[PDB]
Amino acid sequence: RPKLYVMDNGRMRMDKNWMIAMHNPATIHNPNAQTEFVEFPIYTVLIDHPEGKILFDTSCNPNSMGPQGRWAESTQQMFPWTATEECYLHNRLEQLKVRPEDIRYVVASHLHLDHAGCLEMFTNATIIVHEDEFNGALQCYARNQKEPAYIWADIDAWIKNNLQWRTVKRHEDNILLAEGVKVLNFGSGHAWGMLGLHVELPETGGIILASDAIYTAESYGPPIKPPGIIYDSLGYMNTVERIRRIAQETKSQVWFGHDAEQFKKFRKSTEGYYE
Amino acid sequence: ARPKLYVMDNGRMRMDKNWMIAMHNPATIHNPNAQTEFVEFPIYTVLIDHPEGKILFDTSCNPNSMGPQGRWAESTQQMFPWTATEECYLHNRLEQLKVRPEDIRYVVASHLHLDHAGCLEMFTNATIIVHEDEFNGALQCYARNQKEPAYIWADIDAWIKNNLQWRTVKRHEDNILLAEGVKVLNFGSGHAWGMLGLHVELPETGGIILASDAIYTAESYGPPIKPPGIIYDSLGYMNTVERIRRIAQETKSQVWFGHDAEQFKKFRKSTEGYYE
Ligand SMILES: [Co+2]
Ligand SMILES: [Co+2]
Ligand SMILES: [Fe+3]
Ligand SMILES: [Fe+3]
């Protein structure tokens, strides 16, 4: 029945120390060690399920980068996003003959700039988000805090567009969204509140969408290599190991949030789908 | 009780500033290969000559730490090089104050990192006070022959062989009144598995909090708080820092960081005097 699509929403670059912390430490021999600006894919996942279309993540807002962009210049220069018009989410969905208003559920893994970019589009969906992540982002907004990963203007848009929210409580069990689609409540780690997705496809079988719970295969290991972007180190480690257990017990693949090698090997919306 | 508190200079260490201050200098689009720096910082310990008995806070690095025949692994020596003279060695610092290791009643181990638990093995007449989670963590690295850089296998080996007398601070244990005006602070998990601090109330100087690696430097402390790269429990670290700030305010105490070069220079070291 279900069809799962991988949509390419462009690329982002940043200090590798964000991705893998202390990836290249200074030594007595390399006292002035240098980092690297690494490139990684931003992507989203559409599940065209009989019970309704489910969208996982929403990438960046088209009006993010640029001198007249939503992102602060310090953010733009730290986490530059590069994307043709075909990469924009609205376009990727159009290509699939899917309108925003057709989306029943949006699962926001978290509310970082490269995941919650286009939430404002989905005014007919229920937006599922971790309550702690929602609280965290709302505070940034209210306190006009200068947090690089949370876009004041994006949040401003969510409120103005009157999105319909469904917060996953801190100690809430996983949610059965649809047949073979379960929202996993990962809790605090990479961010305040992380959500994942387990999808059971008839043919493909089990998929875990880990998002930023696991940046890359290098993150996953073993051994685990945590990021520099991190709120709760203990929770982050617990989440990874938990994912590892779930993958084993359910014989699922783990789809990382920003692994280039894996993304290349994915079947994109333009090419086809998983079923 | 009219005690005397000594700061002993146990050398200097250097390491990537990212260890000390996480993401201190992130690469950007127009600076994509941003480079880090190798910052130098002091290793010190504190002796409290107290009428009820002598209390030592931290023990610095082991004399046979560095070198080809050293206890530290080469990768450790290269990432966290320790430079010190014979006078900087704790045993010598104590000797110059006419103190023998056997005269130490209590050793408080802030944690069991290489630069704080180096010389525990000296104090075979003392009760070593350590956080149980820290002790457990270190013992695991030992038993698993794990290669954690901050935990020295040979140091731990020595503690066991010397039959040290331990007193573990339990995870949910209250502060310990060690002596009049000396309280062991249970900071719990953060920088490491289990952090201990000290609150000292001196007649003349007033209140001092020894934070060790709960707070690396004034830069760490802020505000704003700038967390380290060497972290186990991020949330616990931040809670601890905020807790120290509150205690400091309420008790009107100075906060002595673990490795603040500037603060260290201002201290009256053991070669010059003490704090009453
Ligand atoms: Co993120
Ligand atoms: Co330490
Ligand atoms: Fe991300
Ligand atoms: Fe230290």
Residue numbers in the entry:
A (entry chain A): 9 to 283
B (entry chain C): 8 to 283
Paper text:
MLLs degrade N-acyl-L-homoserine lactones (AHLs), molecules that are used in a microbial communication system called quorum sensing (QS) to coordinate a variety of behaviors, including virulence and biofilm formation. We provide the structural and biochemical analysis of the lactonase GcL (WP_017434252.1), isolated from the thermophilic bacteria Parageobacillus caldoxylosilyticus. GcL is a thermostable, highly proficient lactonase with broad substrate specificity (kcat/KM values range between 104 to 106 M–1 s–1) for substrates such as N-butyryl (C4) L-homoserine lactone (HSL) and N-decanoyl (C10)-HSL. The binuclear center, common to all MLLs, is coordinated by five histidine residues and two aspartic acid residues.
We report here the kinetic characterization of several variants, including Ala157Gly, Ala157Ser, Gly156Pro and Ile237Met. The Gly156Pro variant exhibits larger changes in preference, with a 254-fold drop in catalytic efficiency against C6-HSL. Intriguingly, the decrease in substrate preference does not change linearly with the increase in chain length but shifts 2.3 and 6.8-fold for C8- and C10-HSL, respectively. This suggests that subtle substrate conformational sampling may occur differentially as a function of chain length (and, by extension, as a function of the acyl chain hydrophobic character and entropy). To gain some molecular insights into the effects of these substitutions on the active site configuration, structures were solved for both Gly156Pro and Ile237Met variants. The structure of the Gly156Pro variant reveals that the Asn152-Ala157 loop is significant in accommodating long chain AHL substrates. The conformational change in this loop may be responsible for the altered substrate preference of the enzyme. We used MDpocket70 to locate the hydrophobic/hydrophilic regions of the cavity along with the MD simulations of C6-, and C8-HSL in complex with wild-type GcL and Gly156Pro variant. Interestingly, the end of the C6-HSL acyl chain, which is the most mobile part of the substrate, lays in the same position as the rearranged residue Glu155 side chain, creating strong repulsion and destabilizing the substrate. In contrast, the end of the C8-HSL acyl chain lies further from the active site and the repulsion between Glu155 and the substrate tail is diminished, allowing tighter binding of C8- compared to C6-HSL.
